[PDB]
Amino acid sequence: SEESQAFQRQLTALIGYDVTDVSNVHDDELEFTRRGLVTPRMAEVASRDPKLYAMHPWVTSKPLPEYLWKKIANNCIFIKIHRSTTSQTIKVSPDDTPGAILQSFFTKMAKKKSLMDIPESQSEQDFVLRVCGRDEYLVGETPIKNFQWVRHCLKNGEEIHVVLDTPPDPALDEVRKESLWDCDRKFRVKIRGIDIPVLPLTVFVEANIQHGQQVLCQRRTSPKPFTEEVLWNVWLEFSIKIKDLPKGALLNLQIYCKVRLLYYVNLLLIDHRFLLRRGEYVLHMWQISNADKLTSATNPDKENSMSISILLDNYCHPISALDVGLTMQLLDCNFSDENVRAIAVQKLESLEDDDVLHYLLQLVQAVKFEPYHDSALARFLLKRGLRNKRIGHFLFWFLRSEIAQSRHYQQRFAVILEAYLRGCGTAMLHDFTQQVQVIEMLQKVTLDIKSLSSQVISQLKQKLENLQNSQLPESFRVPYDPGLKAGALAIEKCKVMASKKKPLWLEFKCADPTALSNETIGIIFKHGDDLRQDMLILQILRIMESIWETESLDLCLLPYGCISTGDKIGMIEIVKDATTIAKIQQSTFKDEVLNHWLKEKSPTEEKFQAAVERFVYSCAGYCVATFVLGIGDRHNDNIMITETGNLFHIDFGHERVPFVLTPDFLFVMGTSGKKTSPHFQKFQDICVKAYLALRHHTNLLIILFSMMLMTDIEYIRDALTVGKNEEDAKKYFLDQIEVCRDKGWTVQF
Amino acid sequence: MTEYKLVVVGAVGVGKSALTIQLIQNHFVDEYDPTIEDSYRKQVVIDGETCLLDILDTAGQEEYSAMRDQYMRTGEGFLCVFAINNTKSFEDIHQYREQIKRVKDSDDVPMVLVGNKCDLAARTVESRQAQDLARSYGIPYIETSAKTRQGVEDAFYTLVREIRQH
Numbered sequence: 001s002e003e004s005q006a007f008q009r010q011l012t013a014l015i016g017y018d019v020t021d022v023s024n025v026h027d028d029e030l031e032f033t034r035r036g037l038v039t040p041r042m043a044e045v046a047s048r049d050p051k052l053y054a055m056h057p058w059v060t061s062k063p064l065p066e067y068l069w070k071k072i073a074n075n076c077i078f079i080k081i082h083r084s085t086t087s088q089t090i091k092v093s094p095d096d097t098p099g100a101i102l103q104s105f106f107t108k109m110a111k112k113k114s115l116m117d118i119p120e121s122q123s124e125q126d127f128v129l130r131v132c133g134r135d136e137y138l139v140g141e142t143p144i145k146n147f148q149w150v151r152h153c154l155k156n157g158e159e160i161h162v163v164l165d166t167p168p169d170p171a172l173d174e175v176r177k178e179s180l181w182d183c184d185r186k187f188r189v190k191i192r193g194i195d196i197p198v199l200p201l202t203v204f205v206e207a208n209i210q211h212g213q214q215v216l217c218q219r220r221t222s223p224k225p226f227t228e229e230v231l232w233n234v235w236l237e238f239s240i241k242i243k244d245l246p247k248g249a250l251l252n253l254q255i256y257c258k259v260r261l262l263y264y265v266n267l268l269l270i271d272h273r274f275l276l277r278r279g280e281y282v283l284h285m286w287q288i289s290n291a292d293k294l295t296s297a298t299n300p301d302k303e304n305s306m307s308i309s310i311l312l313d314n315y316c317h318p319i320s321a322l323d324v325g326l327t328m329q330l331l332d333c334n335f336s337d338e339n340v341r342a343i344a345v346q347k348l349e350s351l352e353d354d355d356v357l358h359y360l361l362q363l364v365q366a367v368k369f370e371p372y373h374d375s376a377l378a379r380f381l382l383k384r385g386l387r388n389k390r391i392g393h394f395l396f397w398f399l400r401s402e403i404a405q406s407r408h409y410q411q412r413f414a415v416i417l418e419a420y421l422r423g424c425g426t427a428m429l430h431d432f433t434q435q436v437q438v439i440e441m442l443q444k445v446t447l448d449i450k451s452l453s454s455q456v457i458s459q460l461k462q463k464l465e466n467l468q469n470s471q472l473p474e475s476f477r478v479p480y481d482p483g484l485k486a487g488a489l490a491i492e493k494c495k496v497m498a499s500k501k502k503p504l505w506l507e508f509k510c511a512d513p514t515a516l517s518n519e520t521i522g523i524i525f526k527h528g529d530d531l532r533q534d535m536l537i538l539q540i541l542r543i544m545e546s547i548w549e550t551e552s553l554d555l556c557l558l559p560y561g562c563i564s565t566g567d568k569i570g571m572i573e574i575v576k577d578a579t580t581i582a583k584i585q586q587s588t589f590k591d592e593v594l595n596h597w598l599k600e601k602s603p604t605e606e607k608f609q610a611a612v613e614r615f616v617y618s619c620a621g622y623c624v625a626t627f628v629l630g631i632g633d634r635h636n637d638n639i640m641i642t643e644t645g646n647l648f649h650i651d652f653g654h655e656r657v658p659f660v661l662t663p664d665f666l667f668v669m670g671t672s673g674k675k676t677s678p679h680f681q682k683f684q685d686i687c688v689k690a691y692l693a694l695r696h697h698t699n700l701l702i703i704l705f706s707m708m709l710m711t712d713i714e715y716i717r718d719a720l721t722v723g724k725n726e727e728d729a730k731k732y733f734l735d736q737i738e739v740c741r742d743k744g745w746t747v748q749f
Numbered sequence: 750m751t752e753y754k755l756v757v758v759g760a761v762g763v764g765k766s767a768l769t770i771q772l773i774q775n776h777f778v779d780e781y782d783p784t785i786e787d788s789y790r791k792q793v794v795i796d797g798e799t800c801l802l803d804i805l806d807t808a809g810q811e812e813y814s815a816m817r818d819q820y821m822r823t824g825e826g827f828l829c830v831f832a833i834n835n836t837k838s839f840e841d842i843h844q845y846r847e848q849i850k851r852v853k854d855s856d857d858v859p860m861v862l863v864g865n866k867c868d869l870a871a872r873t874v875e876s877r878q879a880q881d882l883a884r885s886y887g888i889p890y891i892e893t894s895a896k897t898r899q900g901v902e903d904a905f906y907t908l909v910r911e912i913r914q915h
């Protein structure tokens with residue numbers, strides 16, 4: 001159908017890759033998978049609730065932290081309900097249902113519906129409690145105490161403002177309609193010969209029968225002058241028998257030139273339908289600059305790539321939270337046994353949307369380690385994404401990102417991404433499409449302005465206007481934050497931060513009227529650096545605050561927003577009322593500076609003593625965390641602090657010193673030189689407490705870290721004092737503090 | 750479109766919500782609905798200046814006195830209200846006066862002493878006392894009545910003007 005094709009265009013637009021392509025395919029696994037995923041889709045679509053799906057409540061079954069239960073005074077929690085230019089503070093019990101809270105407020109308005117400005121006729125059942133300024137609803141049979149946003153407010157100590165407005169139309173989430181000659185014969189392959197357009201010793205071929213990173217058999221060929229089309233036409237029979245080939249077995253062919261590896265390509269010996277591969281093959285190889293070294297995909301670049309030629313015999317054919325995360329250990333390169341992997345994914349199904357959100361990235365990457373495209377692991381992601389709009393959001397960008405910069409897996413992630421899009425509803429597709437236009441729009445401007453490297457300062461404003469005038473959406477959903485709708489663009493505040501790369505500082509007027517403020521949305525659109533890094537450091541950082549939460553610890557980390565939107569492109573959230581330590585020292589010189597700035601920003605004296613307490617915790621949170629991740633040694637320029645005293649590192653891309661605990665920091669804790677302080681003591685106590693809390697999960701952390709590097713990790717094992725007991729590790733950290741306590745401004749200047 | 754942040758404070762029951770809802774919806778509420786903290790906004794044109802009023806309706810019950818510092822800080826102008834048939838509330842007006850000076854470490858904070866419920870016969874707070882006190886504080890004094898709309902718009906606009914003269 002034409003329409004069916006008009007919609008395909010639309011999808012190929014978000015995906016960024018064409019799945020109907022056949023140019024770089026030596027079979028049909030991709031096509032077969034595209035149809036294999038249809039069932040899981042409809043199945044998930046058919047069972048989801050139109051109401052709750054469209055509202056996508058953010059809740060949690062975890063109990064409430066002690067540091068949070070303490071927060072709520074008596075058995076109540078104040079909530080402010082807004083409508084128009086009116087708002088009221090209502091008392092509510094932690095165990096009160098959003099709907100219950102709404103029945104209350106409504107009865108309290110038995111004769112005042114006019115004040116709030118609630119249409120007398122307008123039923124009460126036709127109202128929903130939405131967080132003001134963002135697309136976060138408080139709905140469903142769930143205690144107000146279990147909504148992430150509440151916990152967020154209680155925690156950060158902010159007030160809870162909900163705007164009484166109308167529920168989304170579920171109708172907006174409409175979804176479109178639509179055996180061998182002998183299994184005892186030792187396997188063997190015929191290497192015809194290599195070939196290559198241009199060229200920079202001698203070279204031979206290496207053929208291995210593999211099952212993951214595990215090499216079974218291995219054969220080579222007679223060395224020959226690395227001409228332009230070396231030939232061999234030799235048979236390489238392996239010791240393995242057809243029947244002995246393991247499911248997912250690979251034919252690894254590598255070109256060696258002490259010999260050096262230059263090229264490599266892989267071929268699935270046992271196709272998805274459990275059938276030995278057979279025939280003539282011309283595989284465009286990959287070139288040396290790991291999971292990429294395992295991909296079964298061939299090189300998209302047919303024009304200028306080393307092509308090896310093989311021939312396989314043919315035959316006759318008629319016509320329980322941080323615990324579950326440990327399961328992710330079975331989903332890396334170490335385990336390739338489909339069965340083993342399945343059990344693992346199964347075990348992951350018991351996770352809640354909130355937890356999947358925390359491992360979504362690790363999991364996505366884990367897909368590269370799968371022998372075939374269709375797998376439980378992909379189906380788990382597909383389903384968990386079609387089931388929840390917030391997961392779906394991040395699953396989109398994570399996939400669209402990999403597709404935008406990894407040709408080794410662009411094909412696979414694409415088939416998966418399309419599977420999702422075909423069932424996330426029409427509304428979702430639209431929102432996705434608007435976002436794509438923007439990140440694809442500002443992307444242009446970034447290159448149009450970075451190629452101009454002040455009058456450029458005006459070039460930015462100019463170009464922004466071009467977009468500003470009928471071309472850029474009236475408003476879009478901030479990528480790193482699905483709950484934030486950035487509307488108008490405040491070109492005035494837009495600039496071009498000067499650094500190695502040329503990041504773009506953009507401000508956007510919130511598109512939400514209920515927004516309890518005139519502040520603007522700050523997003524840094526940066527090109528050049530691969531935001532894949534940051535995302536991983538942040539992803540872990542969050543898994544740490546939860547590790548500490550299960551121990552009543554709030555180190556006050558600030559995992560700002562960051563999402564990779566393409567290749568070496570992406571955006572990073574901007575934290576208002578926050579500057580870098582460097583800038584502060586640049587606005588003066590004395591070890592008291594930082595402490596001064598704080599008090600200078602804190603209104604009341606009681607406010608200052610707060611930032612100090614918060615500084616203490618945040619600083620301990622990052623010290624410990626940055627040390628266990630091996631990124632403590634940093635520059636004042638890469639460290640920021642909020643006017644409320646919440647320290648936090650940024651820009652992740654990694655004399656000697658454990659971490660950053662300069663004089664100015666120590667000063668704020670009321671210490672200097674070699675002395676102590678009640679606050680500095682508190683700092684040490686927290687450090688040690690947090691540090692040990694992380695060691696209680698040393699395993700989870702190593703499995704999470706290694707998984708990354710796969711797409712020496714023996715350092716973190718030391719940072720985590722593995723082997724040593726509490727009383728020993730405790731001393732280990734304290735000592736590290738003393739190191740910073742003596743380096744002063746050595747490493748900083 | 751200047752935005753004036755006005756705060757209405759006073760004892761419990763003196764009529765801070767009546768005075769407000771009166772000036773907002775131009776209607777007088779008879780039921781007593783104890784307030785914790787309600788907020789209301791209204792685009793008003795004072796002396797042709799066309800501004801925006803941010804009226805904050807605070808609590809009177811000392812059971813929420815904590816949150817006084819919060820608003821007393823962000824507050825641009827205070828409408829110190831008391832009932833003329835209830836002496837206590839009058840005395841309590843000093844309590845608010847001090848905490849505001851303190852919380853704002855100033856002596857010129859824009860304030861307006863408001864005597865309310867003037868439509869009630871049984872007065873117990875002579876206007877001389879109220880005038881003198883107001884005179885002491887160096888701020889205007891305006892008797893009102895959310896029932897008969899007496900002095901209502903005047904009280905609020907006088908505050909907006911106090912905020913302007915400060």
Ligand SMILES: Nc1nc2c(ncn2[C@@H]2O[C@H](COP(=O)(O)OP(=O)(O)NP(=O)(O)O)[C@@H](O)[C@H]2O)c(=O)[nH]1
Nearest residue numbers: 761762763764765766767779783784809866894895
């Ligand atoms: N006669 C008369 N009654 C009034 C006047 N203002 C308020 N009332 C009445 O006094 C009662 C309390 O008024 P209300 O505005 O709720 O007082 P409040 O100071 O805001 N109460 P709270 O301190 O608990 O927040 C109501 O029943 C109301 O009708 C007034 O000017 N005249």
Ligand SMILES: [Mg+2]
Nearest residue numbers: 766782783784
């Ligand atoms: Mg009231």
